Amino acid sequence: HTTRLRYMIDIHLQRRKPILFIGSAGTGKTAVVRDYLNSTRPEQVSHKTINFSSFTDSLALQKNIESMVEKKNGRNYGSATNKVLICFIDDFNMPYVDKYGTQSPIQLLRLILDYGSIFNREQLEERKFLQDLLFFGCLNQKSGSFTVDLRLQRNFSVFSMYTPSSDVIKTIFGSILNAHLSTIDDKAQKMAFKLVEATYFTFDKILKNFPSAKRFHYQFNFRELARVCEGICRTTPGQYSGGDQGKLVRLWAHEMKRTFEDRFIANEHVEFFRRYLTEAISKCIGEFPETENPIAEPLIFTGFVAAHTQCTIPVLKRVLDDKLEEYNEVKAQMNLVLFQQAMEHVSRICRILDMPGNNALLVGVGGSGKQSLCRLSTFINGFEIDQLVVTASFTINDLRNNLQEIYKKIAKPNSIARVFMITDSQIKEEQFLIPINDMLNSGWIFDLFPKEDMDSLVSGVRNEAKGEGVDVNNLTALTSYFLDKIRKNLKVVLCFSPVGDTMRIRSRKFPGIINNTSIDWFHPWPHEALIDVAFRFLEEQSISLNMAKVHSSIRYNYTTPKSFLELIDFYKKLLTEKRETIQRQIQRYEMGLNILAE
Amino acid sequence: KKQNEYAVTLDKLESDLLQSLSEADPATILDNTELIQNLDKTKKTTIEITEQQQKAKVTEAEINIQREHYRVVAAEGSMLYFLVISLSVMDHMYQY
Amino acid sequence: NAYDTIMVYYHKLTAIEGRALEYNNLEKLFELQKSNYKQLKDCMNDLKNLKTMWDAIALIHFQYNDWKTKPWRQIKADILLDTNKTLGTQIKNLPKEIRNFKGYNVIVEKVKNMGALHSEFMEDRHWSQLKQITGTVFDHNSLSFYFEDILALNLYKYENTVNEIVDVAQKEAKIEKKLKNIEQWWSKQVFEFTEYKETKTFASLDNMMEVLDQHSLDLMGMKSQGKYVEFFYDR
Amino acid sequence: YIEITSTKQFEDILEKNEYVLVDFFASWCGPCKILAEQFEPIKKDHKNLTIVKVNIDEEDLESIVESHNVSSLPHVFLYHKKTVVKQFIGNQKDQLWEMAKLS
Amino acid sequence: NVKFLKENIKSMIGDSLLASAFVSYIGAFSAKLRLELWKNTWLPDIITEGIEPLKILTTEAIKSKWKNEGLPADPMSLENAAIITACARWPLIIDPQLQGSTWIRGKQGENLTTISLSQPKWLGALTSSISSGRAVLIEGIQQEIDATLDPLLQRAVKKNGNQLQLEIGGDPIDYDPNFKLFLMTKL
Q: How far apart are CA D23 and CA E53, in angstroms?
A: 77
Q: Are B8 and E64 in contact (CB < 8 Å)?
A: yes
Distance from CA of E42 to the nearest CA of A (A): 8
Q: Are B7 and E64 in contact (CB < 8 Å)?
A: yes
* Residue C11 CB contacts under 8 Å (≥ 6 apart), including other chains: none
Of E5, E25, E45, the CB nearest to A545: E45
Q: In this complex, which chains have at least 3 CB pairs below 8 Å with chain A? A: B, E
Burial string for B44-60 (b: 16+ CB within 10 Å, else e) reads: ebeeeeeebeeeeeeee
Give the B window 37-56 contacts with E, CB below 8 Å. Answer: none
Q: How far apart are CA E59 and CA E73, in angstroms?
A: 14
Residue numbers in B near A593 (CB within 8 A): none
Output the CA torsion sign for A320, A323, A329, A331: negative
Q: Residue A247 in contact with residue A241, Cβ under 8 Å? A: yes
Answer yes or no: D32 catalytic.
yes
Q: How far apart are CA D44 and CA C79, in angstroms?
A: 41
Resolution of the structure, angstroms: 8.0
- What is the secondary structure of chain D as a DSSP string? -EE---HHHHHHHHHH-SEEEEEEE-SS--SS--SHHHHHHHHHH-TTEEEEEEETTSTTTHHHHHHTT--SSSEEEEEETTEEEEEEESS-HHHHHHHHHT-
Q: Residue A109 in contact with residue A54, Cβ under 8 Å? A: no
Q: Euclidean distance between the first and final Cα of chain D, in Å? A: 16
Q: Are D71 and C58 in contact (CB < 8 Å)?
A: no
Question: In chain B, which residue's Cα lies nearest the Cα of A587?
Answer: B18
Beta strands A492-496; A360-363: pairing state = parallel
Distance from CA of A578 to the nearest CA of B (A): 18
Secondary structure of residue A386 in the 3-state scheme: strand
Residue numbers in C near E171 (CB within 8 A): 220-221, 224
Amino acid at E21: A
Question: In chain E, which residue's Cα lies nearest the Cα of C169?
Answer: E161
Q: How far apart are CA E184 and CA E117, in angstroms?
A: 12
Count Cα neighbours of E36 within 13 Å in the Cβ-side half-sphere.
7
Total residues found in chain E within this entry: 187
Residue numbers in E near A543 (CB within 8 A): 13-14, 17
* Residue E9 CB contacts under 8 Å (≥ 6 apart), including other chains: A579, A582
Q: How far apart are CA C187 and CA C182, in angstroms?
A: 8
Of E1, E25, E45, the CB nearest to A554: E25
Residue numbers in E near B4 (CB within 8 A): 61, 64-65, 67-68
Q: How far apart are CA C170 and CA E142, in angstroms?
A: 41
* Residue A307 CB contacts under 8 Å (≥ 6 apart), including other chains: A300, A301
Q: Are C55 and D66 in contact (CB < 8 Å)?
A: no
Catalytic residue among D11, D27, D29, D82: D29
Q: How far apart are CA C48 and CA A303, in angstroms?
A: 36
Total residues found in chain B within this entry: 96
Q: Given phi > 0 = left and psi -120 to 50 = alpha, else beta, which region is D25?
A: beta
Contacting C with CB below 8 Å, chain E residues are 160-163, 165, 167, 170-174
Residue numbers in A near B35 (CB within 8 A): 595
Secondary structure of residue A89 in the 3-state scheme: strand
Of A588, A591, A595, the CB nearest to B39: A595
Q: Residue C180 in contact with residue C151, Cβ under 8 Å? A: no
Question: E strand or H helix at C6, and its extent?
Answer: helix C2-29
Q: Residue C133 in contact with residue C161, Cβ under 8 Å? A: yes
- What is the secondary structure of A454-523 as a DSSP string? HHHHHHHHHHHHHHHT--TTTSSHHHHHHHHHHHHH--EEEEE-TT-HHHHHHHHH-HHHHHHS---B--
Q: Where are the alpha helices (DSSP H) in A17-73?
A: 29-40, 58-66
Burial string for C79-113 (b: 16+ CB within 10 Å, else e) reads: eeebbbbebbbbbeebbebbbebebbbebbebbeb
Burial string for A39-57 (b: 16+ CB within 10 Å, else e) reads: eeeeeebbbebbbbbbebb
Q: How far apart are CA C107 and CA C88, in angstroms?
A: 7
Is the CB of C168 inside 8 Å of chain E's CB atoms?
Answer: yes
Mutate to test the interface with B, among E64, E66, E67, E76 (most CBs of B within 10 A): E64
CA C123 and chain centroid, separation: 17
Maximum pairwise Cα distance, chain C: 125
Secondary structure of residue A264 in the 3-state scheme: coil
Q: Given phi > 0 = left and psi -120 to 50 = alpha, else beta, which region is E159?
A: beta
Please choose, from the candidates A211, A97, A185, A108, the residue with its C-alpha nearest in 3D space to the C-alpha of residue A146: A97
Of C168, C221, C226, the CB nearest to E170: C221
Report the 10 Å Cβ neighbour count for C141.
25
A340-354 and A370-381 are packed helices; what angle lies between their axes, rounded to 10 degrees?
60
Of C54, C59, C94, the CB nearest to D73: C59
Q: Residue A155 in contact with residue A111, Cβ under 8 Å? A: no
Please choose, from the candidates A299, A292, A278, the residue with its C-alpha nearest in 3D space to the C-alpha of residue A344: A299
Beta strands A49-50; A86-89: pairing state = parallel
Residue numbers in C near E126 (CB within 8 A): none
Count Cα neighbours of D81 within 13 Å in the Cβ-side half-sphere.
0
Q: How far apart are CA A434 and CA A393, in angstroms?
A: 19
Q: Distances in Å between the alpha carbon of A95 and those of A32, A90, A104, A317, C126?
A: 24, 12, 9, 50, 54
Residue numbers in C near D85 (CB within 8 A): none
Q: Residue A2 in contact with residue A10, Cβ under 8 Å? A: no
DSSP state of A128: E
Q: Residue B3 in contact with residue B55, Cβ under 8 Å? A: yes
Taking CB atoms and an 8 Å cut-off, how many pairs form between chains A and E? 66
Total residues found in chain C within this entry: 235
Q: Residue A362 in contact with residue A370, Cβ under 8 Å? A: yes
Count Cα neighbours of B37 within 13 Å in the Cβ-side half-sphere.
4
Q: Euclidean distance between the first and final Cα of chain A, in Å? A: 104
Q: Residue E1 in contact with residue A589, Cβ under 8 Å? A: yes
Question: E strand or H helix at A360, and its extent?
Answer: strand A360-363
E71: exposed, middle or buried (Cβ count in 10 Å: 0-12, 13-18, 19+): buried
Q: Are C225 and E170 in contact (CB < 8 Å)?
A: no
Beta strands D2-3; A49-50: pairing state = unpaired
Maximum pairwise Cα distance, chain A: 115
Mutate to test the interface with B, among E2, E55, E60, E97 (most CBs of B within 10 A): E60
Q: How far apart are CA C143 and CA E163, in angstroms?
A: 29
Residue numbers in E near C125 (CB within 8 A): none
Residue numbers in D near C49 (CB within 8 A): 87
Q: How far apart are CA E112 and CA E105, in angstroms?
A: 9
Secondary structure of residue E93 in the 3-state scheme: coil
Catalytic residue among D3, D9, D30, D32: D32
A527-536 and A542-553 are packed helices; what angle lies between their axes, rounded to 10 degrees?
140
Amino acid at A535: F
Q: How far apart are CA A63 and CA A120, in angstroms?
A: 10
Secondary structure of residue B41 in the 3-state scheme: helix
Q: Are E163 and C227 in contact (CB < 8 Å)?
A: yes
Please choose, from the candidates A519, A522, A526, the residue with its C-alpha nearest in 3D space to the C-alpha of residue A263: A519
Question: E strand or H helix at E174, and its extent?
Answer: strand E172-174
Q: Distances in Å between the alpha carbon of E141 and those of C172, E29, E137, E167?
A: 37, 21, 10, 21
Burial string for D60-95 (b: 16+ CB within 10 Å, else e) reads: ebbbbbeebbbbbbbbbbbbbeeeeebbbbbbeeee
A572: exposed, middle or buried (Cβ count in 10 Å: 0-12, 13-18, 19+): middle
Whether B and D touch, i.e. at least 3 CB pairs below 8 A, reads as: no
Cα R_g (chain C), whole angstroms: 32
Amino acid at A110: R
Q: Euclidean distance between the first and final Cα of chain C, in Å? A: 64
Q: Are B4 and E59 in contact (CB < 8 Å)?
A: no
Contacting D with CB below 8 Å, chain C residues are 49, 51-59, 62-63, 66, 90-91, 93-94
A187: exposed, middle or buried (Cβ count in 10 Å: 0-12, 13-18, 19+): exposed
Q: Are E25 and A571 in contact (CB < 8 Å)?
A: no
Q: Are B21 and A598 in contact (CB < 8 Å)?
A: no
Please choose, from the candidates E62, E143, E70, the residue with its C-alpha nearest in 3D space to the C-alpha of residue E105: E70
* Residue A289 CB contacts under 8 Å (≥ 6 apart), including other chains: A244, A245, A246, A249, A250, A281
Q: How far apart are CA C224 and CA A143, in angstroms?
A: 52
Residue A495 sits at φ, ψ, to 5 deg, of -95, 145
DSSP state of A555: T
Q: How far apart are CA E97 and CA A297, in angstroms?
A: 59
Of B20, B30, B39, the CB nearest to A591: B20
Question: In chain E, which residue's Cα lies nearest the Cα of A561?
Answer: E25
Please choose, from the candidates E164, E163, E166, E138, the residue with its C-alpha nearest in 3D space to the C-alpha of residue E152: E166
Q: Distances in Å between the alpha carbon of A392 and those of A434, E168, E169?
A: 20, 11, 9
Distance from CA of C216 to the nearest CA of E (A): 12
Q: Distances in Å between the alpha carbon of C41 and those of C21, C48, C99?
A: 11, 11, 16
Q: In this complex, which chains have at least 3 CB pairs below 8 Å with chain E? A: A, B, C
A376: exposed, middle or buried (Cβ count in 10 Å: 0-12, 13-18, 19+): buried
Q: Where are the alpha helices (DSSP H) in A412-450?
A: 433-441
Report the 10 Å Cβ neighbour count for A482.
20
Q: How far apart are CA A402 and CA A408, in angstroms?
A: 10
Question: In chain E, which residue's Cα lies nearest the Cα of B78?
Answer: E97
Q: Distances in Å between the alpha carbon of A49 and those of A88, A490, B89, E176?
A: 4, 21, 59, 58
Q: How far apart are CA C115 and CA C124, in angstroms?
A: 24
Q: How far apart are CA D31 and CA D40, in angstroms?
A: 21
Q: Distances in Å between the alpha carbon of D37 and those of D25, D97, E62?
A: 12, 13, 89
Burial string for B3-12 (b: 16+ CB within 10 Å, else e) reads: bbebbeebee
Distance from CA of C113 to the nearest CA of E (A): 27
Q: How far apart are CA A584 and CA A26, in angstroms?
A: 68
Q: Which residues pair with A178 in a beta bridge?
A: none
Distance from CA of B71 to the nearest CA of A (A): 32
Residue A154 sits at φ, ψ, to 5 deg, of -65, -25
Residue numbers in A near B20 (CB within 8 A): 591, 595
Residue A342 sits at φ, ψ, to 5 deg, of -65, -40
Mutate to test the interface with C, among D35, D71, D76, D87 (most CBs of C within 10 A): D71
